[PDB]
Design an enzyme around this catalytic site. Structure first.
Site, PDB file in Angstrom:
ATOM      1  CG  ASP A 187      13.018  -0.877   6.509  1.00  0.00           C
ATOM      2  OD1 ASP A 187      12.722  -1.195   7.678  1.00  0.00           O
ATOM      3  OD2 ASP A 187      13.696  -1.603   5.723  1.00  0.00           O
ATOM      4  CG  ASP A 248      -2.499   4.292   4.930  1.00  0.00           C
ATOM      5  OD1 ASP A 248      -3.477   4.694   5.598  1.00  0.00           O
ATOM      6  OD2 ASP A 248      -1.936   4.907   4.018  1.00  0.00           O
TER       7      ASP A 248
END
Length: 596
Positions: A187, A248
């Protein structure tokens, strides 16, 4: 006859995760930590895990994933890597990974490996893994704290120009991978990249584009094929190029926050040129859909907070959107919050779409990027095709007041010649053979269907407009005569360093040779060629690369069918068609057909 071709140049990480299907099923601590604004206590983590192991793990939700509130995780190994989720915890990551293993579950970790804890910096004994010459202290710029400008002073951002930086980052990624973590959630990417947040202001020092690209490349390499790379808060500059190349999953919405309809569908509908481009996941999934599909990106709609919604119809809509888009299915309800809502997550037929690898697209209405024209794609009607040729179709009503009819027509919208058997997956009802799926939906309600075309002599059609696009391939509809809502264009010499391509997932019963057809347009004035491969999910070559030839036709409104033979193996194959540097001309692609 076909001739040998070199491989296409790729611009995506193209891992087994994005090639094999949809996002993972998991649980995350956010339902605890967000409303508490606090790190989850270890006993609350344990009780949630025990609850998951007895209910949801059996439905595939077998990863228990941590989240933020990690400034209080200061204890580290001799190489600066955090040993647990929080300093209050009595047990380390390995203990919890084993506790999860005993319950048929796995550990998911939230961490950004460009974070360097101040406590590790301040301990001169700590040195970089494999680089005893570099103290952890030697990895940071003085004062360069995460969130510096809003008071942060516990985590540094790594200086990737320092000696030892690569070894530190890659070692951090492998540290979790080796612990048995299949999912790493990274994050505050945008805050590293340019130190800006459009909802706050300046938050910390910028680190620049080249450094961001470099850091992502290190993470990708270190994660390899064993650990899935989830990118959270990315700026997605240049149409997501760095994230696509190295990840991904990408978040496509503002944080779930307090949940409910306003976070799912409200806030604002417009695009902006900074994290998050779109605020709500209806718009974000729709807007980033051109980047989805096998070998591209999995779009991440964040966390499902079932108890935060106002009705069971809204809860079903939440789940149906995540499934339609191929997103991770991330439960954030805690054992206290779940109430009577477990059912939302455990409809076996809805889950089966996720297991089978459904990645839907919104219905495309024009070629214009959704960021420039919200009319170009329909946020409320979604479809995707499974490898066996069946489809998931989802219909949504985002009106707050009106009942609205939504319809997907199998010929006009999907581009099929066959119709299909239609099953309503919440009614658990076979509606029989039909030409369309339709629903008169109450405000905030939705419907999701499995649609199964009959197959004459095994003939399976895969429309290109619903497949995966890469390297500049994209949707258009500007030459008539296509089957369905449009076709794929941009299949010509690449504009940069990637070759345009389309990827289809196909399922067949045995290893061997199968008959393929390509419906195409080509009015270049000469034969065009495309490079065609078949591969296993792990990228192992099954067929090709070969140049397949496509005869010139009179006008761009003329369509032909090229014939071929492709060696497909039993089960899942990725069939990719694209235009390499050694290919000739250009085509527009409508569909492929296989006879399995």
């Amino acid at each position: 006859p076909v001739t040998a071709a070199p491989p296409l140049r790729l611009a995506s990480r193209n891992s087994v995760f994005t090639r094999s299907g949809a996002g993972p099923r998991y649980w995350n601590i956010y339902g605890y930590s967000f409303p508490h604004n606090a790190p989850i206590p270890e006993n609350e983590w344990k009780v949630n895990i025990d609850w998951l192991a007895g209910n949801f793990a059996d439905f595939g939700y077998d990863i228990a994933c941590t989240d933020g509130w990690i400034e209080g995780s200061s204890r580290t190994t001799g190489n600066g890597y955090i040993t647990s989720y929080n300093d209050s915890w009595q047990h380390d990551w390995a203990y919890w990974a084993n506790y999860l293993a005993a319950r048929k579950m796995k550990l998911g970790v939230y961490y950004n490996p460009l974070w360097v804890h101040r406590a590790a910096v301040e301990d001169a004994s700590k040195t970089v893994l494999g680089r005893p010459d570099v103290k952890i202290a030697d990895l940071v710029v003085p004062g360069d704290f995460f969130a510096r400008d809003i008071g942060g002073n516990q985590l540094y951002w790594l200086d990737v120009t320092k000696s030892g930086a690569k070894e530190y980052v890659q070692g951090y990624v492998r540290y979790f991978k080796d612990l048995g973590v299949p999912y790493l959630r990274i994050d505050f990417l945008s805050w590293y990249e340019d130190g800006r947040d459009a909802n706050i202001g300046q938050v910390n020092a910028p680190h620049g584009r080249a450094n961001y690209e470099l850091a992502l490349s290190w993470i990708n390499e270190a994660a390899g094929e064993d650990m899935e790379v989830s990118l959270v808060m990315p700026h997605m500059f240049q149409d997501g190029s760095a994230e696509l190349a190295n990840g991904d999953l990408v978040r496509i919405n503002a944080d779930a926050d307090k949940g409910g309809w306003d976070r799912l569908s409200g806030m604002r509908q417009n695009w902006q040129d900074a994290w998050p481009n779109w605020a709500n996941p209806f718009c974000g999934f729709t807007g980033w859909s051109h980047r989805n599909g096998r070998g591209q990106l999995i779009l991440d709609g964040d966390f499902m907070r079932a108890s935060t919604f106002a009705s069971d119809e809204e809860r079903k809509t939440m789940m149906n959107l995540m499934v339609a888009a191929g997103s991770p299915l991330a439960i954030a309800d805690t054992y206290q919050q779940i109430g009577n809502n477990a059912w939302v997550y455990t409809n076996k037929e809805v889950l089966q779409l996720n297991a089978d690898g459904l990645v839907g697209k919104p219905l495309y209405r024009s070629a214009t990027p959704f960021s420039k024209d919200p009319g170009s794609r329909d946020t409320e009607r979604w479809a995707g095709q499974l490898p066996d040729g069946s489809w998931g179709v989802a219909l949504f009503n985002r009106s707050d007041t009106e009942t609205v009819t939504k319809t997907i027509d199998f010929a006009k919208d999907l581009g099929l010649a066959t119709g299909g058997n239609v099953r309503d997956l919440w009614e658990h009802r076979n509606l029989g053979m039909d030409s369309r799926a339709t629903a008169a939906l109450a405000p905030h309600a939705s419907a999701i269907f499995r649609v199964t075309p009959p197959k004459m002599h095994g003939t399976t059609r895969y429309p290109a407009a619903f497949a995966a696009w890469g390297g500049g391939a994209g949707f258009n509809y500007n030459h008539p005569g296509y089957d369905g809502n449009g076709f794929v264009d941009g299949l010509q010499a690449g504009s940069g360093s990637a070759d345009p391509l389309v990827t289809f997932a196909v399922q067949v019963p045995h290893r061997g040779s199968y008959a393929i057809r390509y419906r195409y347009a080509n009015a270049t004035g000469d034969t065009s060629t495309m490079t065609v491969t078949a591969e296993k999910a792990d990228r192992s070559t099954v067929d090709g690369p070969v140049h397949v030839s496509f005869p010139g036709l009179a006008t761009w409104d003329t369509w032909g069918v090229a014939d071929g033979t492709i060696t497909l193996d039993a089960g899942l194959n990725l069939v990719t068609i694209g235009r390499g540097a050694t290919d000739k001309g250009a085509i527009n692609l409508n569909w492929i057909e296989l006879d399995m």
